[PDB]
Design an enzyme around this catalytic site. Structure first.
Site, PDB file in Angstrom:
ATOM      1  N   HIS A  73       0.861  -1.170   0.000  1.00 46.55           N
ATOM      2  CA  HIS A  73       0.000   0.000   0.000  1.00 46.55           C
ATOM      3  C   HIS A  73       0.906   1.231   0.000  1.00 46.55           C
ATOM      4  CE1 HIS A  73       0.359   1.422   4.249  1.00 46.55           C
ATOM      5  NE2 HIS A  73       0.476   0.146   4.567  1.00 46.55           N
ATOM      6  N   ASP A 104       6.190   2.247   7.319  1.00 47.57           N
ATOM      7  CA  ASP A 104       4.896   1.712   6.941  1.00 47.57           C
ATOM      8  C   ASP A 104       4.308   2.484   5.763  1.00 47.57           C
ATOM      9  OD1 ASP A 104       2.449   0.547   6.814  1.00 47.57           O
ATOM     10  OD2 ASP A 104       1.662   1.426   8.660  1.00 47.57           O
ATOM     11  N   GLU A 131      -5.102   1.366   2.310  1.00 50.11           N
ATOM     12  CA  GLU A 131      -5.013   0.464   3.457  1.00 50.11           C
ATOM     13  C   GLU A 131      -5.135   1.106   4.841  1.00 50.11           C
ATOM     14  OE1 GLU A 131      -2.600  -0.011   5.993  1.00 50.11           O
ATOM     15  OE2 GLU A 131      -3.551  -1.855   6.698  1.00 50.11           O
ATOM     16  N   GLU A 156       4.150  -5.019   5.218  1.00 42.25           N
ATOM     17  CA  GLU A 156       3.880  -4.323   6.478  1.00 42.25           C
ATOM     18  C   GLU A 156       5.174  -4.528   7.265  1.00 42.25           C
ATOM     19  OE1 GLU A 156       0.040  -2.868   5.792  1.00 42.25           O
ATOM     20  OE2 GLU A 156       1.664  -2.422   7.208  1.00 42.25           O
TER      21      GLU A 156
HETATM   22 CO   LIG Z   1       0.775  -0.514   6.653  1.00 42.70          CO
END
Ligand SMILES: [Co+2]
Ligand SMILES: [Co+2]
Lengths: 360, 360
Positions: A73, A104, A131, A156
């Site tokens: 994402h 992230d 996300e 992730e």
């Molecule tokens: Co994430």
């Protein structure tokens, strides 16, 4: 210590970080910006950009006939409070880089792009942009296409270890309203009684276990209502969430929580629900988990412990794909001021995906 | 129906209402404004205006050698929300008048001024300006003067009936802080557990009684903390209050409430405490109550039931004076949009105090 692969990852990461993909407000367009950039950084790939609307955009790229799909994402959480410098200007220290989304999870995207540019091995990338918040559309839309893949690796921060399972997630908005027509006169007193029952119930599930994970993570994250100490509050807003273990009956849990309100809450709205990974009956959960373990072994990835946080790997798994979570960085830095990811993590991850994609 | 006495009361009331005495902010000065007005409306009275600072001002007026003291606070609560017209412009209908403070409690002041101007009978008035909020100074300062009076009548809306007793009052500000070093991690969870214990305890006092009043009125009027549903809230603010019956151990109650917090609340601050009326041991409370009843009988005032709301009659009573609450209007209209008091109530009250002051 530096390598060409890491150097390239850092260059791509600096650019990726500079693109504002904060969500909310998710002001992400199909044309221009980050997607126009990725279009020019994927040599040999057949590329398609699909606008699902309102900032939900996907870039599906395929080179050759890959057996695995890498999903990353591109949206990030909002910035601050407390960032010591421009969140969109990546900074670098002797052992790490700092920037919104470096951990992230743009670091993974940068590494995958670096790998794409270091060899022409088969590979499939799905870059999504929704996300981090509600109203997601990308993954659901992709799943509806029924494209075959032996496994899907969702990025992730997992400290560069293959995670095979994680909790599901639920977020709920509740509103209590005083009943003038009385022990229920106060919306705050109602919220207090509801909260006591809810916490007591959570305690009753403390012995549930799955891959090292125990009990039900539950959290009343926001309560707001009333004006003055001695004035009866006619209204109160409460927001809570919980993270079920795989196989837990989420529908039943939600109804149980809702039923603790007496009188009934004026409003009870589940704003988001994400499945656990894997999901389904305990037998299915274990079978799916083992299939993911086999894939991790096949790709020579170190296996990490199940995690408490949520990821869209859950969606691919519920869709029938063997899925695992894999990415550089520590979740501890996610959504924090001066978010960072170590060069060591970046190096380990990029070397691994380059190996998977271009290695002998 | 109209009388000269009522007409005069209404004229004085219109003027009194026009003066902004909202508290907060309690921007009340000793010079000019409402006090300069009262100075010119008390013929035959020896008048003194004492500035206690920051909006706490008193006007003590004495004519002759009166045996009774009438205390009336001139400050009002803030206006709105929802007033249909200027709160400081008194409006009139066929049976009532509307305006900020007409019911609580400028109507009583207007009537007393009317009586002062309808005859030269002995009378003592103490007009204060800090009853509606914290940091009061007027009554405490007056009590320190040790001036003798057979009884003190404090004005508050009592439907023109003599009230001889009422609950005490306490307001508390609490702050919970999460303990990262854990079931106490969330300040909201802590507040929830505290609230459950507090409400349970209140329930245990439901059988306490005094003059028709039952149990302990308790109220959590404000709770505010947290940001999102699944984010652990490190801080939470809670404001609550309770109204003890006379003779209840308030010190003990407060400590009990404070002790329900585990861990201890990061902050526990009682912002206001007012005694019950009367106050002290049950024997003293009943003796004092009977003395007040005798005074009401002597002044031929109809006796009303004890009330739940608080008044400064409690202060005079704790100071050794026989005290009662007496005023026109219904507490139901106090602190409400388009606050009103009926002409019938105004007429009954003004005729009564005129009788006490100027009657044969
Ligand atoms: Co994430
Ligand atoms: Co009042």
């Amino acid at each position: 210590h530096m390598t060409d692969l890491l150097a390239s990852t850092l260059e791509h990461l600096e650019t990726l970080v500079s693109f504002d993909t904060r969500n909310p407000p998710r002001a992400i367009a199909a044309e221009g910006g980050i997607f126009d950039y990725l279009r020019a950084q994927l040599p040999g790939f057949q590329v398609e950009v699909i606008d699902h609307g309102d900032g939900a955009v996907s870039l599906y790229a395929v080179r050759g006939t890959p057996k695995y799909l890498f999903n990353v994402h591109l949206d990030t959480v909002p910035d601050s409070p407390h960032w010591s410098a421009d969140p969109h200007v990546m900074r670098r220290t002797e052992d790490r880089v700092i920037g919104l989304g470096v951990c992230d999870i743009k670091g993974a995207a940068a590494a995958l792009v670096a790998a794409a540019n270091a060899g022409d091995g088969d590979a499939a990338f799905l870059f999504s942009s929704d996300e981090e918040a509600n109203d997601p559309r990308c993954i659901a839309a992709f799943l509806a296409r029924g494209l075959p893949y032996d496994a899907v690796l969702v990025a992730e921060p997992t400290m560069s270890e293959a995670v095979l399972a994680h909790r599901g997630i639920s977020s709920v908005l509740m509103r209590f309203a005083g009943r003038a027509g009385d022990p229920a006169a106060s919306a705050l007193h109602q919220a207090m009684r509801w909260g006591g029952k809810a916490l007591d119930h959570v305690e009753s599930l403390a012995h549930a276990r799955f891959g090292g994970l125990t009990g039900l993570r539950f959290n009343i994250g926001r309560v707001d209502g009333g004006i003055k100490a001695n004035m009866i509050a006619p209204a109160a807003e409460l927001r809570f969430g919980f993270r079920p273990l795989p196989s837990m009956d989420v529908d039943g849990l939600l109804a149980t929580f809702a039923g603790f309100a007496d009188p009934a809450a004026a409003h009870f709205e589940e704003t988001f629900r994400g499945p656990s990974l894997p999901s389904g009956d305990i037998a299915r959960a274990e079978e799916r988990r083992l299939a993911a373990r086999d894939v991790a072994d096949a790709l020579d990835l170190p296996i990490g412990n199940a995690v408490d946080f949520w990821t869209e790997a859950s969606l691919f798994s519920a869709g029938g794909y063997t899925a695992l979570v894999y990415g550089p960085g520590d979740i501890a830095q996610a959504h924090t001021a001066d978010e960072f990811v170590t060069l060591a993590q970046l190096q380990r991850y990029v070397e691994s995906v380059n190996r998977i994609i271009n290695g002998s």
